[PDB]
């Protein structure tokens, strides 16, 4: 599913990401924009042989099982395919663990490079939230 911007903002808010670990909703929407273009089905292979999955590009080396990432962990205890669903519940629950892991939103490289320090409130402009 390709979310609209405000549609994703409302779902992320409903699932408890606004101000989660102190990150405002606009940071999460910006991260999803640049990680996945708001596409739940986005996948991207990494050089280490892991893959990133879903709207927040969650990595199979640590967080989910895809059966092809040797020596990897599954700390969200989910198949990586669960992160491609139209229902973002699994992605949000797993993102909450990732952002709690010690480096905050720096775990999302597109957030660090394209959102961090910018006017992230712009990403929820116009939304009825
Ligand atoms: Na894994």
C-alpha 41/C-alpha 81 separation (Å) is 9
| CATH code of 64's domain | 1.10.530.10
DSSP secondary structure string for all residues of 68-79: -STT---TT-SB
**Whole-angstrom distance, CA of residue 108 vs CA of residue 95:** 10
CA nearest neighbour of 72 among 82, 80, 62: 62
96 CA to centre of ligand 1 in angstroms: 17
Q: Which domain holds residue 123?
A: 1-129
Cβ(48)–Cβ(124) below 8 Å: no
Q: Is 22 helix (H, G, I), strand (E, B) or coil?
A: coil
Number of H helices, E strands in the chain: 4, 3
- Cβ atoms 35, 8 nearer than 8 A: no
In 3D space, the residue among 46, 49, 41, 14 whose CA is nearest the CA of residue 28 turns out to be 14
Q: What span, in angstroms and rounded, lies between the C-alpha atoms of 6 and 121?
A: 12
Residue 93 Cα to ligand 1 middle (Å): 16
The total number of structural domains that make up the chain: 1
Cα atoms found within 13 Å of the Cα of residue 72, Cβ hemisphere only:
24
Residue 103 CA, ligand 1 centroid: distance in Å: 20
Distance CA 77, CA 93 (A): 11
Q: DSSP code of 128?
A: -
Active-site annotation, residues: 35, 52
Kindly give the distance from the C-alpha atom of residue 66 to the centroid of ligand 1, in angstroms, as a whole number. Answer: 6
18 is annotated as contributing to ligand binding: no
Q: Which of 56, 51, 20, 59 lies closest to 38, judged by CA?
A: 56
């Amino acid at each position: 599913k390709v979310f609209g911007r405000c549609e994703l903002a409302a779902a992320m808010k409903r699932h408890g990401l606004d101000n989660y670990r102190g990150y405002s909703l606009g940071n999460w929407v910006c991260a999803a924009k640049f990680e996945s273009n708001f596409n739940t089905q986005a996948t991207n292979r990494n050089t280490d042989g892991s893959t990133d999955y879903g709207i927040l590009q969650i990595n199979s080396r640590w967080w989910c099982n895809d059966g092809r990432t040797p020596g990897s962990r599954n700390l969200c205890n989910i198949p990586c395919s669960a992160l491609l669903s139209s229902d973002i519940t699994a992605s949000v629950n797993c993102a909450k663990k990732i952002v709690s892991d010690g480096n905050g939103m720096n775990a999302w490289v597109a957030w660090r490079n394209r959102c961090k320090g910018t006017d992230v409130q712009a990403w929820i402009r116009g939304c009825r939230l």
